[PDB]
Amino acid sequence: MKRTFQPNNRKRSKVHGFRSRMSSKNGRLVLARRRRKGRKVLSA
Amino acid sequence: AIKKYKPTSNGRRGMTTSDFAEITTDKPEKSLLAPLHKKGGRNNQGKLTVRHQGGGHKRQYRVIDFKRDKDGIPGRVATVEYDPNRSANIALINYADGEKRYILAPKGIQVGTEIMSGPEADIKVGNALPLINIPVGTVVHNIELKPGKGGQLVRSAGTSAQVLGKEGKYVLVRLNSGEVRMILSACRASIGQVGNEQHELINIGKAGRSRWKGIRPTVRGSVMNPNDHPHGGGEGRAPIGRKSPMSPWGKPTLGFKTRKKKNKSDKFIVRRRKN
RNA sequence: UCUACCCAUGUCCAGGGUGAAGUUCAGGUAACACUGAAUGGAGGCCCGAACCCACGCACGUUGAAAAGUGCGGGGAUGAGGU
RNA sequence: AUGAGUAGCGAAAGAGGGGUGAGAAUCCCCUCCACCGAAUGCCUAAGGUUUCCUGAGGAAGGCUCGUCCGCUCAGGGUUAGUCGGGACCUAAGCCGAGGCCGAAAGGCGUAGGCGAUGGACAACAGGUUGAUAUUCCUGUACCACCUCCUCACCAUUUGAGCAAUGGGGGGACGCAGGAGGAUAGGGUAAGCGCGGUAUUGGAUAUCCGCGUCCAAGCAGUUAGGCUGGGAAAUAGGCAAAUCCGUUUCCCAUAAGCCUGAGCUGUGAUGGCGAGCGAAAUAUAGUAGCGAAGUUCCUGAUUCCACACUGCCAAGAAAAGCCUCUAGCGAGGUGAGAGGUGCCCGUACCGCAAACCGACACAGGUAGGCGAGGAGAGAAUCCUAAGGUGAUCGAGAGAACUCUCGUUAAGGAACUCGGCAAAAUGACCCCGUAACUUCGGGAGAAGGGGUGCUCUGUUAGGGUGCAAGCCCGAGAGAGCCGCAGUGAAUAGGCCCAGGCGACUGUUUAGCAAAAACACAGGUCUCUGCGAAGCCGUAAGGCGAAGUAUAGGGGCUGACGCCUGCUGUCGGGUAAGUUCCGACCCGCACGAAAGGCGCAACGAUCUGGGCACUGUCUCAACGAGAG
């Protein structure tokens, strides 16, 4: 009975990381939106 | 050169195979092998464009010479081997200097025979002669573009063509299919027919063997529902929209021509067989 | 990061079997037949654990569990599992 | 608030004597008893993050209690030239200077890089703390670099060194099968230490325990492979080449070459070892002391080693580490002394109460070891080394529900339907039908014997001077139970018909069937270098394919053929299933019929034998609520 979440640090950083989000313009838009609201944790 | 298996068990029942009674070796030349990976029928975008293609055994590519450029220097046949990426068999020629190349094996070649490519080369068989030979003779491996590109037509097991008349800078030649075309006389070809003519008569036997060669199952377009294929998708009623299945991409495919008009190549064709 | 298909690179499958074949060696027939031996023994073969499925019944159903357990069942060198 | 002091308290064996304490069914110690053992044992991934060690605690959390804890508060604990990763190499894929397309944003791509799940690569034995150890300590080693100051032979094109840019090799590679060799491991006979027994009897063929050892550096070895060497000459390998190919001779026909599991000495006057067991250390047990340490049988799922043989599906990638050629351009070999020869991880749990499931949840989680008896076996039952007592209890033995054990006489009379349960099942011997596509059907169907003693260390073999093991057949005799595979694990068979070969979907979680798809084959139609397909294009797939690729309909396979509602009978004491005749039609240049052989078919429909608590019709007993 496999559940849907299986942890892995490499995949997490490669998909949702900061250095990944800073590649397209849409990722930079996401970062700007997070900064405007005031979140403590930007990206992952 | 065909071996029939005993009906020991279902699956092996009816399976016919070759005897490979022409291959005199079992190892390739480590200097003419090159890597080759599978593709699954996927584009540079990563999407499926060609269906029923994926899987199989691994394979290494052997570099073949379809240009027969070495002219004058003689060479001798050394071995006839097996190539997994083609229908015919290949031959290793040891040139006088010591170059070593692979050539499409002509029908009836044997170790020892000394080959010769060039405008002054003799007829015999395997000899690559430019388009200046007799107005008859089984010819194979022909270059459409002026010499330099390499043979493109008549290159598979059992295939054979014939030279007819010569029209100024062109040569009338009948193609395997049955069509006749004018080929720039500047081009070159070889002499003889491609071998292993028993390739057209082998029963695969079981689904497994087909999968080993890289072919995936095919689902009838009729059974798939109308979203995926034009017409189909029934459970308990008489055929739903069926009896006119059409191609899966919404285009006619029965007695429908495809040769594009304004071909700009309708000046060199003369007869019409399979267009 | 679940699941569908594809690409590159690794790994797993206790034991047993009437016994298939091609093939070869001898007797044997002009040779096919027919005897022995080897061939072991290839095969989407057979019985069967690990492993993978999910066919029947019963229980559970404000459950131990938002899809399970118990007892039987199918595949098990391959169009295999991971 | 009500329901209500009601339902539940989440698989499992404990009992007593001490202890401590304000307080003990639940915490510590002891002794008996019980459970797992191809794991509930050990080592170690991913993931977790301090959960690890010691001293205090009794607010909250532990489905009860608690003096206890993976909980709370304070202190501590992780040591590398050799282990894993980086100052090494590349795969799929990704990024991409110039560049090509595109209203913009952007898409693609060359040179060049990044990227292990793979390739290269120098260390082993023993000891120690409350918490780390190929890292600390003690012994013996190896690898790359330098000459601080050295030392001995040996210095300039009188060539030392030199690689690519060349070439070899790797990296070199698939699947299956069966010999051989050798070890890891498992059990005897000498030997060494203990004991001579209060229940009848044992000084004895009596009982208990023990019986070794590294890497290196020495020597010599099974086996394996070569394609055999030697001399000349070169239209090839961007220049070069003595290197590699190629050719011509000469001799072979045994030399030579290169790889090796393992064994014998030396590492070792070393260190391990049954058991003796100091003080008091804090009375532990350590300090400390320490005997013999051999021969014989049986051995791989490990190593030689993808080494050998066969097969077609043709098999591995790739590059570097390595040798060797020349283009380039002076010191090399062996000792002594060094650099200390950098960075990151190192605690603890990893079949689980520390990970994923909202929980201290009967679920899920790559890999390496994985003993004995009986046994073909990693099956089954009982046990080694080792681990555990699984966190609510007392007592009564009502109805009822669930999980189990028996049952008089009948057996399918039950029911939509033998659903469910019962019966068979292990070896060895004899025998084995119609029908076939000749392989099958076939463990068809059906009958017989197994325990224990003596001839008997049987004949023989292997095993090996022998001894010690087996496969030990095969016999004879003779004893005794109701019972001989005495427990646990292991096919119920037999007749007639439709539909479809092994496989996949199931409709992950109401359908796994004739459902349904697939499939080897058949047929038709388009493509001569392409047709198709994806994109606005650029760019690709087809394909480093050349009558091979698309698309359609068919489809076991293989055949033949060939296109390509009666009513009656016959079954049951009382009949759908099948008949042979009635057909009513035929539709069918394909399309039908007639073709079950096999299926390993969890398929649908009829009928027999055995067996039974399914029932006539219920009765006791065991455990949980």
XYZ file of C-alpha atoms (C1' of nucleotides) in Angstrom, chain B residues 7-8 10 13 20 26 30 34-36 39 41-45 49-53 57-63 73-74 76 82 84-87 94 96-100 144 152-156 159 175-177 179 181 202-205 207 209-210 212 217-223 229 245-249 251 253-259 265 274-275, chain D residues 91-94 107-109 167-175 227 234-237 244-248 311-319 437-440 501-502 515-522 524-535 537-558 597-599:
172
model
C 6.049 -29.200 -33.265
C 7.483 -30.017 -29.816
C 2.792 -24.576 -29.313
C 5.005 -24.932 -34.018
C 23.091 -18.569 -41.725
C 31.486 -14.568 -35.353
C 36.809 -3.283 -33.500
C 30.190 2.669 -33.778
C 27.553 3.315 -30.986
C 23.788 3.398 -31.766
C 14.536 6.110 -29.826
C 9.538 6.744 -31.955
C 9.903 10.095 -30.155
C 10.742 13.553 -31.654
C 13.149 16.304 -30.490
C 10.139 17.507 -28.454
C 5.275 10.650 -33.740
C 5.753 7.049 -35.015
C 3.685 4.276 -33.312
C 4.235 0.468 -32.965
C 8.007 1.005 -32.442
C 17.802 -6.143 -28.282
C 20.856 -3.803 -28.209
C 22.808 -3.322 -31.484
C 26.165 -1.823 -32.625
C 26.380 -0.101 -36.065
C 29.015 -1.206 -38.608
C 30.166 1.585 -41.029
C 44.214 -0.323 -55.915
C 43.011 -4.023 -55.789
C 40.502 -9.284 -51.636
C 26.061 -10.700 -40.140
C 21.825 -6.609 -37.294
C 20.901 -3.193 -38.828
C 20.122 -4.361 -42.431
C 18.578 -7.237 -44.468
C 41.478 -6.218 -47.503
C 46.445 -3.995 -51.253
C 47.656 -0.985 -49.210
C 45.990 -2.258 -46.002
C 42.878 -0.103 -45.448
C 40.063 -2.593 -44.577
C 20.604 9.232 -57.971
C 20.579 4.883 -52.397
C 18.340 2.684 -54.634
C 18.374 -1.194 -54.832
C 20.297 -2.005 -51.608
C 18.306 -4.787 -49.862
C 16.940 -6.654 -55.020
C 13.901 0.077 -60.965
C 13.114 -3.026 -58.802
C 9.478 -1.838 -58.305
C 9.224 1.802 -62.926
C 13.826 6.358 -64.866
C 10.558 -16.934 -42.713
C 7.643 -17.353 -40.219
C 8.387 -15.333 -37.013
C 6.397 -17.966 -35.040
C 4.588 -12.690 -30.579
C 10.147 -12.876 -31.623
C 8.499 -9.724 -33.096
C 12.712 -8.908 -29.848
C 1.169 -4.305 -30.553
C -1.344 -2.534 -32.855
C -4.963 -1.849 -31.771
C -7.617 -1.845 -34.555
C -8.831 1.706 -35.135
C -12.414 0.447 -35.222
C -12.431 -0.818 -31.628
C -10.092 7.154 -34.039
C -12.909 3.520 -40.316
C -10.636 6.019 -42.148
C -7.090 6.820 -41.020
C -6.572 7.788 -37.356
C -5.564 11.310 -38.452
C -7.361 11.473 -43.896
C -6.305 5.950 -47.224
C -7.719 3.672 -49.970
C -6.932 4.177 -53.694
C -5.660 7.658 -52.728
C -2.532 9.063 -54.460
C 0.108 10.965 -52.406
C 2.906 11.769 -54.899
C 11.170 15.420 -60.839
C 4.240 2.092 -57.311
C 4.765 5.695 -58.635
C 25.895 7.215 -20.786
C 20.538 8.816 -21.372
C 19.436 13.773 -20.617
C 20.409 19.083 -19.755
C 12.041 27.888 -29.925
C 16.166 24.983 -31.734
C 21.247 24.054 -32.109
C 48.414 2.657 -32.950
C 47.422 -1.214 -29.539
C 44.774 -2.416 -25.347
C 40.951 -1.650 -22.576
C 36.089 -0.590 -21.134
C 35.255 -5.548 -24.039
C 31.186 -6.704 -22.087
C 24.947 -11.189 -24.770
C 21.892 -15.699 -23.069
C 47.124 -18.519 -33.418
C 55.812 -1.322 -47.978
C 50.308 3.218 -53.058
C 47.290 2.581 -45.924
C 46.864 5.018 -40.238
C 49.989 -0.869 -36.493
C 48.073 -2.990 -40.856
C 49.527 -5.618 -45.911
C 52.547 -8.726 -48.950
C 56.844 -12.332 -49.951
C 22.154 -20.475 -30.062
C 20.278 -16.256 -32.726
C 17.500 -12.029 -30.933
C 24.177 -10.661 -32.770
C 25.267 -8.668 -27.295
C 26.959 -4.102 -24.104
C 27.854 0.945 -23.976
C 31.357 4.988 -24.266
C 35.538 7.672 -22.946
C -1.778 -31.425 -36.253
C 2.184 -37.582 -34.375
C 4.927 -33.771 -30.295
C 0.844 -35.585 -27.238
C -3.869 -20.945 -28.344
C 0.902 -18.427 -23.843
C -16.311 -10.053 -21.536
C -12.442 -7.477 -24.079
C -7.862 -6.525 -26.343
C -3.328 -8.663 -28.172
C -0.910 -12.192 -31.025
C 1.944 -15.810 -35.448
C -0.595 -15.673 -40.270
C -4.040 -13.613 -44.615
C -6.022 -4.653 -49.833
C -4.171 0.390 -50.733
C -0.267 4.246 -50.906
C 5.252 5.843 -50.970
C 12.290 5.706 -55.609
C 14.000 8.893 -51.176
C 10.032 9.108 -49.879
C 5.169 8.778 -48.327
C 3.235 9.798 -43.590
C 3.893 12.464 -38.496
C 5.171 16.864 -34.886
C 5.900 21.987 -34.951
C 8.727 28.443 -38.490
C 13.682 26.706 -37.653
C 14.223 21.794 -36.344
C 13.251 16.472 -36.042
C 10.639 11.139 -36.084
C 10.526 7.655 -40.121
C 16.170 6.112 -40.784
C 22.874 6.691 -40.018
C 16.428 2.306 -43.199
C 15.927 2.058 -50.173
C 10.466 -2.604 -51.772
C 11.448 -1.050 -47.561
C 8.426 1.932 -44.875
C 2.933 3.944 -43.903
C -2.551 3.183 -43.514
C -7.143 -0.319 -43.591
C -9.869 -4.734 -42.752
C -9.068 -9.614 -40.989
C -6.824 -13.191 -37.050
C -6.052 -19.142 -32.524
C -2.468 -21.733 -35.273
C -3.453 -25.391 -38.484
C -5.344 -32.352 -30.858
C -3.581 -29.710 -26.915
C -4.297 -25.877 -23.402
